[PDB]
Every structure is written in structure tokens, then in C-alpha cells.
Amino acid sequence: HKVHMQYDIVAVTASAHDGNLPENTIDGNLSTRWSANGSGQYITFDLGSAKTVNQVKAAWYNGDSRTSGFSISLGSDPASLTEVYSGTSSGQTNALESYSFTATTARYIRITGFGNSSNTWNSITEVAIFHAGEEAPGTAQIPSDLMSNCNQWKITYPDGSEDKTLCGEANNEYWFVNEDKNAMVFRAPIRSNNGTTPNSSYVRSELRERKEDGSADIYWTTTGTHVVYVKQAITQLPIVKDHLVATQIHGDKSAGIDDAMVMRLEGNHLFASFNGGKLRSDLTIKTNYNLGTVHEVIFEVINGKHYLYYSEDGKLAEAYANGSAAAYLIKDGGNDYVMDLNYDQSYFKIGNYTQSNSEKEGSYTGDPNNYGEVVVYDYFVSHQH
Ligand SMILES: [Ca+2]
Ligand SMILES: [K+]
């Protein structure tokens, strides 16, 4: 189900009534009604303040035996109202009918009545006011706009190519700005023979940490304080092997470290994985992760101690900045930290590493919806010693 928010109607007035009061339209009762005789008469609903509205619902007196003509108008003052919908009721139901229009800011909503099939009465039994289907929109045009330092990363695409100079790059099919112009999207489709990427290799659209001037790949150590914060949603998984890696700390394979600490989603299972189980056992974050749920995550390394913070409440960045973030730690038994280990040659990765390919998807390879996807609203990293 798409999400549909319902605004409370705090008051209602009208140009006219015959003793069937305007309040009768919001009492949840099908046997009470508003009535006013004459084309042009209207009822006006008040939401208390201005809200984004894109749907009005009405149920009509004799809604299943006659049709009613009307128009809807919206705005912040009752003399500043602009028309957004006009038409006729269906004549086939006594329940709510949905009338939807361009989302518009309004405090007041007015239905104007033009009589009905039989006579000039306007009569309404129920009315509701809605936004039908959540981060504030932005002004991003290209993915580099969402990066605070566009020099500090390089991207690796699913076609096997790389870009070390992301400042100014255009939106592409693997890395682009979402609709609301507030996030970057890392899309990793599953296809056979995609550029130089082997069919048996897994598929990434993801950032690798660089020096802040972009001169080269950066390597750091577990000594000192090192942080990655990401606000993101995992929005899609492949069809057969619905497995995907988002945020990561990486060291050398040669040292038995490799992908030391990563966030992984398998189905609804969201967990942290430590060199794929070779350092320590997977640690579960959530068993019921729903695709498209915006979360925040921090990996924090302090002289070898690895801490995991997770939140779906929107407040993790604010809390970490205010110093009150302990509430969001993912604890492991009776330890505040999920792992203690020292290594060097370490760097961060952010984005989408989809753990599937053409061999695992087989016949569903090339399918339109056979891709992994990660939407990143915000992120930062810090280093200290
Ligand atoms: Ca009623
Ligand atoms: K470039």
C-alpha cells in the first residue's frame, strides 16, 4: 500500500444550510448531512494551518441514485482560493469518492455545489481531506551536488569502468539524482557481459574513499578516531539472490581483514558482516527491514574498537552532534562495541555493492527490475589521530 496521510478537519462553515448543518460532514455518520439549495452554494473546510493537499473525498446524499456537480478550490485565505478540480459525482455509491489534483498548499478547502440530476440541492454526508502517495525536497541537479567534497571519492560502475574525477559529472543510469533532488542513487542492474565486469563477479555502483584533494587512494589505520555516517535507504534487491552490501570498512585481503565491517541486507535481514563471517559472526541489526525505509548508520573506529549505530527515527546525526547517541548503539551481548581489531591499509566505501550476477540470476538476467539499489540522502567521514 502506498502511504496516504489524512488531515483532521478542525472546523467547517458554508454559504448556507437548511438546518442540516455543515458539521454533519465530518461526524463519520452516513445518516447526517449538510444541505443547501441552489447552484453556487458551498461548504468550506478548515485544517487549522496550511498542509500539502492533493485529494478530497466526498460521499453524497443519494450518491447511488443521482449525480451532483461541483468544483473544489483551495488556499490559505477563504478569498484567496483557486480552483483545482471540477466535475461530477459518479451516481453509483453512497460511500466516499476520491477527487485528486496537483498537490497544493492549503489551509482551507471549499467544495462548491451546482445542484444534482433531479434538483438544485447540494447534500453531502461525509468529507475527508488527504495527501495520497519523506525527506524534504532539495535542489540537487547532478550527483556531485550532494557531495560535500566531490574530490574525496571515486566511483566504480557495474560496467567495470571507474571515474576518479566526479566533480561536475552528469547523471547516468548507475549514479543519478532522485526525483526529489535530495539524494544520489546507486543502481546496479544484473546483466550478462556488462563492459569488462566478469559474469561471475558481483556488481557495484559505489564510492571508494580518496584523499581530500583527489590526488590518490587514501589508506588509514584503526589507530585514532575514524567515522563514516550515512543516511540512506536500500530500495531494491535482485530477484533470485536478493543480497546487497551498502556501507563498508575495507582492509587488505592478504592480512585476513578484507571487508572488515560492512552493512548487508538479505531479504528483510539487515546485518553487519565481518569479512563474511571469518573475523566474527554476523550481527543482526533488524530482521524486518522493509525496502525503501530511510535509515542512518555510523561505523566508528577508535583505536581498534568498532562501534555500530543505527536509527530509523531521523535523529542519529543530530544526536551524535549533540553527544547523546549511545541510545542508537547496536550492542553485542554486554559490549558497547561489536568488534575490537587492529589493522592498517584501511578505507571507507559508500553506495551499492550488489551480491548477485548473471550466473546466480540465470534466466531473470536482463530483467528490468533485476537490480540492487541504494539511495543516499547524506553522508560524512572524519579522521583524527
Ligand atoms: Ca454525516
Ligand atoms: K570525470
Numbering used by the authors: -5 to -1, 188 to 315, 322 to 573
From the paper:
Like many multidomain alginate lyases, AlyQ contains two additional carbohydrate-binding modules (CBMs) at its N terminus. AlyQ’s first domain moderately resembles family 16 CBM (CBM16), while the second domain belongs to family 32 CBM (CBM32).
In order to understand the relationship between these CBMs and the catalytic domain, we have characterized AlyQ’s activity and substrate binding, as well as solved the structure of a truncated version containing the CBM32 and catalytic domains. However, only AlyQBC successfully formed crystals, diffracting up to 2.2 Å in space group P41212 with one molecule in the asymmetric unit. In accordance to size-exclusion chromatography results, analysis with Pisa26 showed that all crystal contacts were not significant — AlyQBC exists as a monomer while domains B and C do not interact with one another. A Ca2+ ion is found coordinated by the side chains of the strictly conserved D209 and T214, and the main chains of N206, N211, T214 and T307. Moreover, an acetic acid molecule from the crystallisation buffer is found binding to the nearby R248, which may mimic the carboxyl group of an uronic acid. Subsites +1 to +3 are relatively well conserved between the two, and the three key residues for catalysis — Q436 neutralizing the substrate’s carboxyl group, H438 as a general base and Y541 as a general acid — were superposed well with A1-II’s Q189, H191 and Y284 to interact with the ligand, indicating AlyQ also employs a similar mechanism for alginate cleavage.
